[PDB]
Design a protein around this motif. Structure first.
Motif, mmCIF file in Angstrom:
data_model
loop_
_atom_site.group_PDB
_atom_site.id
_atom_site.type_symbol
_atom_site.label_atom_id
_atom_site.label_comp_id
_atom_site.label_asym_id
_atom_site.label_seq_id
_atom_site.Cartn_x
_atom_site.Cartn_y
_atom_site.Cartn_z
ATOM 1 N N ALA A 603 -6.331 45.643 66.245
ATOM 2 C CA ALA A 603 -6.089 45.877 64.842
ATOM 3 C C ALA A 603 -4.603 45.636 64.538
ATOM 4 C CB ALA A 603 -6.552 47.264 64.446
ATOM 5 N N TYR A 604 -3.723 46.131 65.402
ATOM 6 C CA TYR A 604 -2.313 45.938 65.245
ATOM 7 C C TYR A 604 -1.945 44.466 65.370
ATOM 8 C CZ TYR A 604 -1.876 50.960 65.223
ATOM 9 O OH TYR A 604 -1.975 52.295 64.890
ATOM 10 N N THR A 634 -3.882 57.455 72.926
ATOM 11 C CA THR A 634 -3.917 58.720 72.183
ATOM 12 C C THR A 634 -2.487 59.239 71.834
ATOM 13 O OG1 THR A 634 -4.127 59.741 74.370
ATOM 14 C CG2 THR A 634 -6.123 59.520 73.023
ATOM 15 N N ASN A 635 -1.422 58.525 72.222
ATOM 16 C CA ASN A 635 -0.027 58.814 71.824
ATOM 17 C C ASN A 635 0.512 57.778 70.823
ATOM 18 O OD1 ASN A 635 2.524 60.297 72.065
ATOM 19 N ND2 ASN A 635 3.227 58.765 73.557
ATOM 20 N N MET A 636 -0.275 56.765 70.493
ATOM 21 C CA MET A 636 0.075 55.657 69.575
ATOM 22 C C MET A 636 -0.093 56.082 68.128
ATOM 23 S SD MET A 636 -1.374 51.507 69.673
ATOM 24 C CE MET A 636 -3.012 52.187 69.587
ATOM 25 N N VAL A 637 0.844 55.665 67.249
ATOM 26 C CA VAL A 637 0.636 55.821 65.853
ATOM 27 C C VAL A 637 1.065 54.577 65.063
ATOM 28 C CG1 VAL A 637 0.840 58.354 65.782
ATOM 29 C CG2 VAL A 637 2.856 56.988 65.787
ATOM 30 N N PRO A 638 0.510 54.329 63.883
ATOM 31 C CA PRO A 638 0.862 53.124 63.150
ATOM 32 C C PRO A 638 2.250 53.206 62.540
ATOM 33 C CG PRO A 638 -0.997 54.215 62.093
ATOM 34 C CD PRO A 638 -0.525 55.076 63.188
ATOM 35 N N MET A 639 3.030 52.172 62.759
ATOM 36 C CA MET A 639 4.427 52.159 62.251
ATOM 37 C C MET A 639 4.801 50.765 61.767
ATOM 38 S SD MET A 639 6.672 54.798 64.480
ATOM 39 C CE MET A 639 6.212 56.541 64.515
ATOM 40 N N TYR A 640 5.342 50.667 60.560
ATOM 41 C CA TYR A 640 5.899 49.425 60.067
ATOM 42 C C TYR A 640 7.103 49.120 60.930
ATOM 43 C CZ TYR A 640 3.318 49.845 55.584
ATOM 44 O OH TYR A 640 2.381 49.920 54.637
ATOM 45 N N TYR A 690 -5.212 51.611 55.539
ATOM 46 C CA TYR A 690 -5.641 51.618 56.906
ATOM 47 C C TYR A 690 -5.008 50.419 57.572
ATOM 48 C CZ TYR A 690 -9.039 55.135 55.710
ATOM 49 O OH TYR A 690 -9.585 56.267 55.280
ATOM 50 N N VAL A 691 -4.932 50.458 58.884
ATOM 51 C CA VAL A 691 -4.494 49.354 59.671
ATOM 52 C C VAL A 691 -5.639 48.300 59.487
ATOM 53 C CG1 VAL A 691 -3.802 48.465 61.958
ATOM 54 C CG2 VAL A 691 -3.196 50.814 61.340
ATOM 55 N N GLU A 692 -5.232 47.047 59.266
ATOM 56 C CA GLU A 692 -6.191 46.019 58.840
ATOM 57 C C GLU A 692 -7.396 45.925 59.747
ATOM 58 O OE1 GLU A 692 -4.408 42.376 57.819
ATOM 59 O OE2 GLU A 692 -6.201 41.144 58.113
ATOM 60 N N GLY A 693 -8.583 45.943 59.151
ATOM 61 C CA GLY A 693 -9.830 45.766 59.897
ATOM 62 C C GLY A 693 -10.233 46.963 60.747
ATOM 63 N N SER A 694 -9.660 48.145 60.468
ATOM 64 C CA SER A 694 -9.960 49.346 61.238
ATOM 65 C C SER A 694 -10.129 50.570 60.370
ATOM 66 C CB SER A 694 -8.830 49.632 62.220
ATOM 67 O OG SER A 694 -7.699 50.244 61.569
ATOM 68 N N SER A 695 -10.448 51.660 61.035
ATOM 69 C CA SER A 695 -10.466 52.956 60.374
ATOM 70 C C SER A 695 -9.213 53.777 60.743
ATOM 71 C CB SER A 695 -11.718 53.723 60.794
ATOM 72 O OG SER A 695 -12.796 53.112 60.112
ATOM 73 N N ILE A 696 -8.136 53.116 61.193
ATOM 74 C CA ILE A 696 -6.902 53.833 61.572
ATOM 75 C C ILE A 696 -6.113 54.041 60.259
ATOM 76 C CG2 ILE A 696 -4.847 53.890 63.019
ATOM 77 C CD1 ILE A 696 -6.108 51.715 64.650
ATOM 78 N N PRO A 697 -5.994 55.284 59.809
ATOM 79 C CA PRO A 697 -5.271 55.584 58.567
ATOM 80 C C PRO A 697 -3.783 55.450 58.723
ATOM 81 C CG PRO A 697 -5.812 57.653 59.635
ATOM 82 C CD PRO A 697 -6.360 56.512 60.537
#
Ligand SMILES: *[C@@H]1O[C@H](CO)[C@@H](O[C@@H]2O[C@H](CO)[C@@H](O[C@@H]3O[C@H](CO[C@H]4O[C@H](CO)[C@@H](O)[C@H](O[C@H]5O[C@H](CO)[C@@H](O)[C@H](O)[C@@H]5O[C@H]5O[C@H](CO)[C@@H](O)[C@H](O)[C@@H]5O)[C@@H]4O)[C@@H](O)[C@H](O[C@H]4O[C@H](CO)[C@@H](O)[C@H](O)[C@@H]4O[C@H]4O[C@H](CO)[C@@H](O)[C@H](O)[C@@H]4O)[C@@H]3O)[C@H](O)[C@H]2NC(C)=O)[C@H](O)[C@H]1NC(C)=O
Ligand SMILES: Cc1cc(COc2n[nH]c3c2CCN(C(=O)c2ccc4[nH]nnc4c2)CC3)c(C(C)(C)C)cc1Cl
Ligand SMILES: Cc1cc(COc2n[nH]c3c2CCN(C(=O)c2ccc4[nH]nnc4c2)CC3)c(C(C)(C)C)cc1Cl
Ligand SMILES: [Ca+2]
Ligand SMILES: [Ca+2]
Ligand SMILES: [Cl-]
Ligand SMILES: [K+]
Ligand code: NA
Ligand SMILES: [Zn+2]
Length: 796
Positions: A603-604, A634-640, A690-697
């Motif tokens: 997704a990233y 499980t320690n990853m988070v979405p970041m610009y 969400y992260v593109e194409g995912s359910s990651i908010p």
């Protein structure tokens, strides 16, 4: 319409308003033009002034006099305040020694200590020291009672928003008085300092103290005082009301002074002309105290001496003009001054574009003395967004400056040398708090606190249940001798799962391009053996319904949300001695958590705007075996990427710096989702991105809570006593347009950004639905104080 034919005889400043036909004699009649024709003659007497003289002692009562020096005046409750001094050889209150008030010493019939709120407009915090030699009465209250070095106002640091916050316990976004000037688009109505529209009750939300009181059977005197009623008359009116019979006498009173603010605007906060207003307010305090002492109430009443905001040096020359930035300046409406609010001049203009306005205002001159924000991007500590009366575009103005639309506004309207309204952490905007009386502590200093906390305390002082508000009830218990409020910690709603090893590596498809002595040791770290070290204050409690897992690791512990696919919180302790190490695109499945409840690297890869970071910093890994845990999915988070510059500098440079300075720190970090900018945790269905194409908010913000021992000779992980905290809520933005110096190295701008976005733990609690500090050795009220602390980064 007005019908004036009746009389105020025997009714001056009557508490119960009367409706037509009857004309009015209460304190608001002047503002509604509804006063009986003889109001001035009967209710605003001035004959012979405000002071008894030896020659008046024992006079035959003459009902024309402003106040009385006749033998009967005490029983009537209308003596001049200095009567007993001049006629009965008593001393002024200020000349008496301070003596502890251990219990209320009240007349018979008093069911509780009255409360008098003595509010002073524009009374800057540093006046308590700088003006000490000319304010002996105030200095006595301060030294003998309970005082803070300062009290933090709300933003904007304007009068009506602050006074109404004092009355309600609410942020301006919630009570609705978001400025001294406002436009409500729902009502299509404008609120102005001048004019009638402000009298409409629709502006004034929440439940102010006088209503809380009335609803619970506690009577209240006026809070609003008409500007023309001189201070002396306001004091005498309060004293007369305190002489009323038991079933008519109020229990709560307010006094308001327009000084020192009135002069401060003309002369600046420390102009030489300011000494006389300060002397005059002190004299008014001494009138009230002498008056109370006459009535045998000076050891009965609780007095709160409080300001609304401070005052800063601001001149006409230090004005920024939007006409120097905007080609389209005639297409906007600006609410100007020490803050800016922009909207479209016409809602029928389809060319109006906020993004273009914001871009035209962003870092356009090197010394630019304001910064534009969309309101959702303002520092969350300001709690300044969730009201339709707050325009989308905000200008945060530097202290000492103004913004205006065009120069002709600032010469067809130098006059003023002072103003206020700036960011509520600015030192010049700080104001005062003193509490004096039987319910307050004796000769006690308390740390600075926020004015949103006082409504609860005033309710405690009067035996009232407060209306729902933004205070943290119990956090000011340390001001009080008695009537403390003793709450219980909120019940945990969701209990955690504690998953073990349940999944094989080949069950995952992440797209990430990848000895029994150390085997029972890694098992025991996964079962929670170092948890005592990394979770110093208990696990945070989850106060909403959800599904989450506790995950243990050598270097950190997390509460992992199966619903948001990332941690809610990640907790770790960095000692003073810890080492920082160098660090790539390896992210590893966590065999405790199903593929379906995990993120993925694909997704990233597909989302060309979004990257990822880690909550527990791989830089601070204890051993190269522990370092693998930092790269768990499980320690990853979405970041610009723009935000990763900030986060990496925090993690790689600042955490260790803080551990060095503070003798270890415990850090709790996590995401915040507040897409509707209400300061409250979003539900799953409020998430806009969400992260593109995912359910990651995608989070709107990232927080950290950084805790250490107040006694820094003790390490954070072995602290015997009180704690020290600083926190932040950083906006998770796809650019660094906020930071005008961001093209430079992070050491020249990141820390400045973090300081602006400083936060209380309680802000983070609202935003996450978590409750921190559940298992400490400290009293729960001390912890509530801790949770309201804000690290402001302003010098003394
Ligand atoms: C600071 O402390 C305060 C006080 O505790 C916190 O504010 C509270 O927050 C709650 C959540 O945001 C909120 O609860 C809502 O109340 C709604 C009923 O509200 C009215 O009645 C109360 C009671 O007397 C009154 O106080 C309210 O006053 C507000 O509105 C008037 C005018 O409109 C203003 O004069 C006044 O200043 C105040 O305005 C502020 O709050 C409103 C929101 O109420 C904002 O819009 C303003 O900008 C301003 O901030 C009201 O007169 C109730 O209807 C809500 O329920 C909805 O959501 C739930 C989900 O749980 C659902 O079950 C309900 O059915 C309902 O959903 C339906 O409506 C939706 C929206 O129309 C719709 O989309 C759905 O499909 C559904 O049909 C909710 O219970 C409470 O009102 C405020 N109180 C106050 C005084 O502000 C604040 O959170 C604290 N801040 C922080 C950061 O901690
Ligand atoms: C709601 C509101 C309206 C208007 O106006 C009024 N109309 N009606 C009242 C007001 C003033 C406030 N107010 C009191 O001061 C008061 C309280 C208790 C009492 N008990 N007895 N008398 C009392 C008088 C309540 C009644 C203003 C402004 C500032 C615009 C005046 C401010 C506000 Cl918050
Ligand atoms: C203790 C307490 C008292 C009051 C009464 O406050 C007032 N009584 N009389 C006035 C006020 C406010 C200032 N005011 C202004 O217009 C003004 C003054 C200075 C300025 N400086 N800059 N702009 C300014 C605008 C009008 C005079 C209230 C309520 C909420 C009722 C107002 C709540 C509480 Cl807890
Ligand atoms: Ca003011
Ligand atoms: Ca929210
Ligand atoms: Cl304003
Ligand atoms: K990407
Ligand atoms: Na920038
Ligand atoms: Zn002012």
């Amino acid at each position: 319409w007005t019908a004036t034919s009746g009389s105020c005889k025997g009714r001056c400043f009557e508490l119960q308003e009367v409706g037509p036909p009857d004309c009015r004699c209460d304190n608001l009649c002047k503002s509604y033009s509804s006063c009986c024709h003889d109001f001035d003659e009967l209710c605003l007497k001035t004959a012979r002034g405000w002071e008894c003289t030896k020659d008046r002692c024992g006079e035959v009562r003459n009902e024309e006099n402003a106040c009385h020096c006749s033998e009967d005046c005490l029983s009537r409750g209308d003596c001049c305040t200095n009567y007993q001094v001049v006629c009965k050889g008593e001393s002024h209150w200020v000349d008496d020694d301070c003596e502890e008030i251990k219990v209320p010493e009240c007349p018979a019939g008093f069911v509780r200590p009255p409360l008098i709120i003595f509010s002073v407009d524009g009374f800057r915090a540093s006046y308590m020291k700088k003006g000490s030699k000319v304010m002996p009465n105030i200095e006595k209250l301060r030294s003998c009672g309970t005082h803070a070095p300062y009290m933090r106002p709300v933003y904007p640091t304007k009068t009506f928003p602050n006074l109404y916050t004092l009355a309600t316990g609410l942020y301006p976004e919630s009570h609705g008085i978001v400025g001294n000037s406002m436009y409500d688009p729902v009502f299509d109505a404008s609120f102005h300092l001048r004019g009638r529209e402000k009298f409409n009750h629709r502006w004034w939300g929440g439940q102010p103290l006088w209503i809380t009181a009335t609803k619970q059977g506690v009577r209240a005197g006026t809070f609003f005082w008409s500007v023309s009623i001189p201070h002396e008359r306001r004091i005498l009116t309060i004293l007369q009301w305190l002489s009323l019979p038991d079933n008519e006498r109020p229990s709560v009173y307010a006094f308001y002074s327009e000084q020192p603010d009135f002069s401060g605007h003309k002369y600046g906060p420390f102009g030489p002309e300011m000494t006389n207003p300060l002397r005059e307010i002190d004299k008014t305090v001494g009138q009230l105290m002498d008056g109370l002492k006459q009535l045998r109430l000076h050891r009965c009443v609780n007095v709160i001496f409080v300001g609304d905001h401070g005052m800063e040096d601001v001149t006409c020359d230090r004005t920024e003009f939007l006409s120097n930035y905007l080609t389209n300046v005639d297409d906007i409406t600006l609410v100007p001054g020490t803050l800016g609010r922009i909207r479209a001049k016409s809602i029928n203009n389809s060319k109006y574009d906020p993004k273009t306005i914001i871009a035209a205002l962003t870092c356009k001159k090197p010394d630019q003395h304001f910064k534009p924000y969309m309101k959702q991007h303002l520092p969350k500590r300001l709690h300044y967004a969730n009201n339709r009366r707050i325009e989308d575009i905000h200008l945060l103005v530097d202290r000492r400056w103004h913004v205006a639309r065009k120069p002709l506004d600032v010469y067809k309207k130098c006059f003023f040398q002072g103003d206020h309204g700036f960011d509520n952490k600015v030192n010049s905007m700080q104001t005062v708090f003193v509490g004096y009386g039987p319910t307050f502590k004796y000769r006690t200093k308390v740390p600075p606190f926020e004015n949103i906390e006082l409504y609860n305390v005033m309710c405690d002082l009067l035996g009232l249940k407060p209306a729902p508000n933004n205070g943290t009830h119990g956090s000011l218990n340390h001001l009080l001798r008695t009537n403390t409020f003793r709450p219980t910690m909120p019940d945990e709603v969701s209990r955690p799962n504690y998953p073990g090893i349940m999944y094989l590596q080949s069950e995952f498809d992440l797209g990430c391009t990848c000895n029994k002595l150390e085997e029972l040791n890694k098992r025991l770290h996964t079962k929670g053996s170092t948890k005592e070290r990394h979770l110093l204050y208990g696990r945070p409690a989850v106060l909403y319904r959800t599904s989450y897992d506790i995950l243990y690791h050598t270097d950190f512990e997390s509460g992992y949300s199966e619903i948001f696919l990332m941690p809610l919180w990640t907790s770790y302790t960095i000692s003073k001695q810890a080492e920082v190490s160098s660090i790539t695109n390896c992210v590893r499945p966590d065999v405790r958590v199903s593929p379906g409840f995990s993120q993925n690297c694909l997704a990233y890869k597909n989302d060309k705007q979004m990257s990822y970071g880690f909550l527990f910093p791989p830089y601070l890994s204890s051993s190269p075996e522990a370092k693998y845990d930092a790269f768990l999915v499980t320690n990853m988070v979405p970041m610009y990427p723009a935000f990763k510059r900030v986060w990496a500098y925090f993690q790689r440079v600042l955490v260790k710096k803080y551990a060095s300075e503070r003798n270890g720190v415990n850090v709790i970090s996590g995401p915040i989702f507040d897409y509707n900018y209400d300061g409250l945790r979003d539900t799953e269905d409020e998430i806009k991105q969400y992260v593109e194409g995912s359910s990651i908010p995608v989070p709107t913000h990232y927080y950290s809570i950084i805790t250490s021992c107040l006694d820094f000779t003790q390490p954070a992980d072995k602290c015997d006593g009180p704690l020290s905290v600083s926190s932040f809520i950083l906006p998770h933005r796809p650019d660094n347009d906020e930071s005008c110096n961001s093209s430079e190295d992070e050491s020249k701008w990141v820390e400045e950004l973090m300081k602006m976005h400083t936060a209380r733990v309680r802000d983070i609690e609202h935003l996450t639905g978590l409750d921190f500090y559940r298992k400490t050795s400290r009293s729960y009220s001390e912890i509530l104080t801790l949770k309201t602390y804000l690290h402001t980064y302003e010098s003394e």
